């Protein structure tokens, strides 16, 4: 159930059930990332865990 994925690869029952589901998650989406001598870091630690980071 991804927007990038083409819907010809799912049955119609899967296609109609694709938009009505709930995603309680924590996501990062970047459409484009051109790095020129850069150091990108896309971390998402999101569920409540130990505060201290090793």
């Amino acid at each position: 159930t991804d927007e990038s994925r083409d819907r010809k690869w799912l049955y119609y029952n899967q296609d109609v059930q694709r938009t009505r589901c709930k995603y309680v998650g924590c996501t990062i989406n970047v459409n484009s990332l051109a790095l020129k001598n850069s150091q990108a870091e896309l971390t998402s630690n999101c569920t409540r865990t130990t505060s201290a980071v090793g």
Partner: protein, 132 residues
């Protein structure tokens, strides 16, 4: 071990601390229900490392106090900079300006000229015969 074996073992020994939140007292379950906090998210035997849990308990603990926050960037183009998308939604604090140093196992290149220079260099020495 399989879920059925887990159930059989824990029914054989219902007082074992290893299996105490798979089959907790109704008191704990209803305290958790009446607090709007499911018991498996805070009850200590569930948090125990050696505690044995079935598939259902695991896949319900995996949704314990999970937030719903998303970041949707577009066309990002950075030069000579740093990008730090954190999207952090919990008590954990990201370590800002924490320089992560690794072991640079650098391999030192040596000043070895390509030994194809060896004949030509000899020719250089040879031209001393022009000065004799």
């Amino acid at each position: 071990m399989t879920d059925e074996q887990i159930y059989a073992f824990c029914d054989a020994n219902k007082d074992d601390i290893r299996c105490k939140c798979i089959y907790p007292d109704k008191s704990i379950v209803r305290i958790g229900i009446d607090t709007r906090l499911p018991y498996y998210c805070w009850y200590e035997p569930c948090k125990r490392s050696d505690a044995l849990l079935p598939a259902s308990l695991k896949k319900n603990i995996t949704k314990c106090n999970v937030s719903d926050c998303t970041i949707s960037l577009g066309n990002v183009s950075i030069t000579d900079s740093k990008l730090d998308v954190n999207n952090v939604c919990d008590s954990k604090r990201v370590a800002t300006e924490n320089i992560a140093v690794r072991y640079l196992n650098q391999e030192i290149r040596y000043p070895i000229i390509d030994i194809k220079w060896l004949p030509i260099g000899l020719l250089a020495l040879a031209i001393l015969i022009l000065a004799f």
